[PDB]
């Protein structure tokens, strides 16, 4: 997954809980939702345990980068926590060889 709109978060959830569950590698650098998946995966503890400072920080970057409503930004943070929880299937291609 690269770049990717609001839809790719639910697509990551649909592929995270797949039959059987299958990995979702996300290449960062491009931006948009792949970068909030990456900025989760870097430092989100036990996946869905994004802490409170990140809560406000992630919700600022969602409500600013996606330009969506604040309720939708909180809701995509909850779907993000659902997807982030299974981060062992998530891999990030941090470019920079």
């Amino acid at each position: 997954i690269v770049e990717g709109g609001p839809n790719v978060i639910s697509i990551v959830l649909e592929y995270l809980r797949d039959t059987p569950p299958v990995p979702v590698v996300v290449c960062d650098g491009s931006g948009r939702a792949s970068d909030i998946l990456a900025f989760g995966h870097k430092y989100s503890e036990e996946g869905g345990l994004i802490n409170e400072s990140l809560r406000d920080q992630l919700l600022v970057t969602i409500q600013k980068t996606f330009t969506y409503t604040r309720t939708q930004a909180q809701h995509l943070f909850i779907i993000l926590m659902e997807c982030m929880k299974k981060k062992e299937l998530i891999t990030v291609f941090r470019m920079g060889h």
Binding site: D56, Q57, V60, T61, K64
Partner: peptide
Amino acid sequence: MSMRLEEVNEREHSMKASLQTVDIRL
């Protein structure tokens, strides 16, 4: 210069994040 540019890129990333958060606060 390559390793010290890795300093400047990481440090300024915190500068861009703090400026964006201060814009939300004000």
